[PDB]
């Protein structure tokens, strides 16, 4: 009787957590479609742009952080950039001196963006992109991103899509791991 | 010209978050400040005692400092800055599991050996002009996920990056995004 009561409590907890996990698994599917769906369309526009605006460059920097290649760096060669029709000066690390030229030259850029390893914690990248997330509203906003160019909005969405997918994946593993441990204990209890 | 002050930036960041507590947050988002954060101040950072993920990406930081005084840091994100040298990380070496530092100016991996618990290293688009750094990097017994896409050495490689990368380090499980593959291992053996 004690085992049965424990199993029933475990089952109720498992069902609520499973519903949360199921929502997270659709959220992750939507996030994966968001970046995978953009394909090389956004990349072709970025290549076509050639010399993008500072707001567009910031969106590229977020994508560059995931790439982890030749990232610019604690503000060297960084200056305040005017945004839209507002004379506002905001402090930033600034765009990469030569990282973009090397990335643009490679024909595997579509191959790089198109395939991303699943279940990637990216703790080092998220800390690097943590400052960008707080200021995201100012320059990573979809309305602001769309205004500079159609392609820039897609690249920012592509960077944003991957971050959302990573958060969903972490929740799916951890909260899912607690649900899974409860389920395993329940299964052992059920065999008993 | 000292355009960005961490305390100033921190004050804005704290205000934007609107969290009562300066150091309660597990993910501190200091990325993309306008104007950029230049050089981080260790003393100001030290208050971030709960932080597991420090986001300092998309700024203009030139160096690494104030590793000590950090107690829970697991993910250090410094991508798209102006960093040249891996250093001043002893203060977080006991806990740091991921270093995200793509789009910087790192050509030498000297000093990476201190991050004994590192599992993930993202460093796309850095400098890196020799597989010499990888030998130093190997001492990382827990390193499973590595990103080198965009590096100068890869360009001079003149061979598929995914394969050679797998061959270079036995420990890595994922290289430039890709999962370990039986076929990939066979290809590496052939190489």
Residue numbers in the entry:
A (entry chain A): 3178 to 3369
B (entry chain Q): 2 to 192
Task: Quote what the paper states about this structure.
Axonemal outer dynein arm (ODA) motors generate force for ciliary beating.
We thus have obtained an apo state, depicting the post‐PS conformation from a nucleotide‐free dataset. Our analysis shows that in the absence of ATP, all dynein linkers interact with the AAA3/AAA4 domains, indicating that interactions with the adjacent microtubule doublet B‐tubule direct dynein orientation. The tomographic map suggests that the γ linker is in a Post‐2 conformation, which was observed in neither MTBS1 nor MTBS2. MTBS1 fits worse than the MTBS2 model, which has the β and α homolog linker in a Post‐2 conformation. To optimize the fitting of the MTBS2 to the cryo‐ET map, we performed rigid body fitting and real‐space refinement of individual parts of the structure by Coot. Step 1 is the translation and rotation of the γ dynein head including the MTBD. The linker of the γ‐HC changes from a Post‐1 conformation to a Post‐2 conformation.
